[model samples]
Target: EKVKGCDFTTSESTIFSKGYSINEISNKSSNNQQDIVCTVKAHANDLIGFKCPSNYSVEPHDCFVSAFNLSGKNENLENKLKLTNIIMDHYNNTFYSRLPSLISDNWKFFCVCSKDNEKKLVFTVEA
Candidate 1:
């Protein structure tokens, strides 16, 4: 019931492998009590994405994002997984923009993962 596939995997494709753009994601609707989740390769040009329901009261967009230097060479980004965090506050049923200065020239690895919150049905992301 927890996120698994990504925890032990890595992608060598470019970040935009999924054609990522804030504008693109903004056009989506997470209605019907649904949530959106997806992963992309950190081709030194990567990104992490999280979309929330339009109803601000249904949930708060606490989208957590991060970057890693893949040289960890381990199954997961541990030692090389440099971290940064920012909350994705979507006040207008609309969302947020680019992440803060997380470097990529290193062709580093980036990923997405979340933790179960105090509420079993709830979870928060880390990437």
Candidate 2:
């Protein structure tokens, strides 16, 4: 087929506005470490490492060479891209970094560039 588009939001906290809160800034002297905790524009998300392009064909990278798998949540989570969709729909684009229930740094992320199945495809990562 044809490449549809290029790479690239929603229901967060009511008062949060966008990403980081402002109350964190306040001091008599001065201290600005990692000035930006991130906002509508960030380096991370609520789900896995990479965002899927087309819900199925992981855009910008699909139909390429090689592929991979995801496990952890279950030992045999090789559900292909279907598994990816399942997780995404189940979690949406949640703000794990701020959510009290979710731990951003607790899980391990990984990707396996497999040479099996449909070669020259997109690879996926999981916890």
Candidate 3:
């Protein structure tokens, strides 16, 4: 059986097109497990942000974000076909707004293409 998770082949085209560089990738597995983990370092800080309101695709929260300058035919991101499921982490950013909140420095992408999953992708950006 083939398991697919945190793979560049899955979103390489979209990521590269957006001008985000994949610094490095690490794969880890256990003798009794079937899940993998991937850490992606992008060149820019466009992928991390708070969930936007219903009217906007991107939100303008206290945190700042960026993306490839979409001009002419050079767009930042594009998924010809939307993948089945995509998940990210927002920790306290979503559930809580009181006390000294926990700050997240990076974002993660998780997808389950099949019953058996591949691994988790941990993505990061710079300040």
State TM-scores per candidate. Answer: 0.25, 0.20, 0.22
- Per-residue lDDT, model 1, residue 30, is 24
lDDT of 1 by residue, 60-104 (tens): 222223222234323423234443343354452222223335644
**Backbone clashes in model 1, listed as residue pairs:** 15-46
**Alpha carbon RMSD to native, model 2:** 14.9
List candidate 1 stretches off by more than 4 Å. 1-37, 56-80, 83-87, 92-127
TM-score of 3: 0.22
Task: List per-prediction Cα lDDT, in the order shown.
Answer: 0.29, 0.24, 0.25
Residue 58 error, candidate 2, Å: 12
Candidate 2 TM-score versus the reference: 0.20
- Please give the lDDT score at residue 103 for candidate 2: 34
lDDT of 2 by residue, 1-127 (tens): 1111111111133323332222322221113342211212221223222222122233222211122222223333232222223222213322112112333443222321122332222222222
Those runs of model 3 whose alpha carbons end farther than 4 Å from true positions after fitting are 1-32, 45-105, 116-127
- Residue pairs with backbone overlap in model 2: 64-120, 65-120, 66-120
Global lDDT of model 1: 0.29
